[PDB]
């Protein structure tokens, strides 16, 4: 038993809800919240900009130190940093950004990072400003992640489309 509430169950291990991930994180304090990161951990907009704003820019300060030490992530890769006031940990995961021409097949590699964590609160990778089809992203999530994932979908309209079209 865990503290996630109001989710629709899609499969044995994937759950979905219409929610703001920042507010969902603020209430649940999950062990892991996933950020839709870029390779530079520049949290300017989308989910990343919203998560970072909710931390009062502490996520960005920590991220800049991480990059200064380690260099950029790989597309499809991840790193674990603090969850600040939102979660114990933040798993920063880089999905391919279609608006940069990155290979959508890397989306599966991105979701594989979730399997290193037993339970996660997450957005749909490569959705939103990353330019991928959120329905495809949901399919890859379901077919790749084996751990327990609670997906927060900000837009009520898209949520209904994702549920109604789910096979
Ligand atoms: O940034 C993107 O392209 C979208 C944003 N989406 C979100 N999903 C779940 N909660 C969210 N709260 C927010 C608050 C904001 F101010 C901006 C975006 C969100 C948001 C998923 C996405 C595809 C992977 C990242």
From Swiss-Prot:
Reactions listed under catalytic activity: Thiol-dependent hydrolysis of ester, thioester, amide, peptide and isopeptide bonds formed by the C-terminal Gly of ubiquitin (a 76-residue protein attached to proteins as an intracellular targeting signal)
Residue ranges occupied by any Macro domain in the UniProt entry: 1-167
Annotated phenotype, changing residue 164 to L: In strain: Gamma/P.1
Its job: Responsible for the cleavages located at the N-terminus of the replicase polyprotein. Participates together with nsp4 in the assembly of virally-induced cytoplasmic double-membrane vesicles necessary for viral replication. Antagonizes innate immune induction of type I interferon by blocking the phosphorylation, dimerization and subsequent nuclear translocation of host IRF3. Also prevents host NF-kappa-B signaling. In addition, PL-PRO possesses a deubiquitinating/deISGylating activity and processes both 'Lys-48'- and 'Lys-63'-linked polyubiquitin chains from cellular substrates.
Record entry for activity regulation: Inhibited in vitro by GRL-0617.
Subcellular location: Host endoplasmic reticulum membrane
Subunit comment: May form homohexamers. Interacts with N protein.
Protein name as it appears in the record: Papain-like protease nsp3
Topology in the lipid bilayer: Multi-pass membrane protein
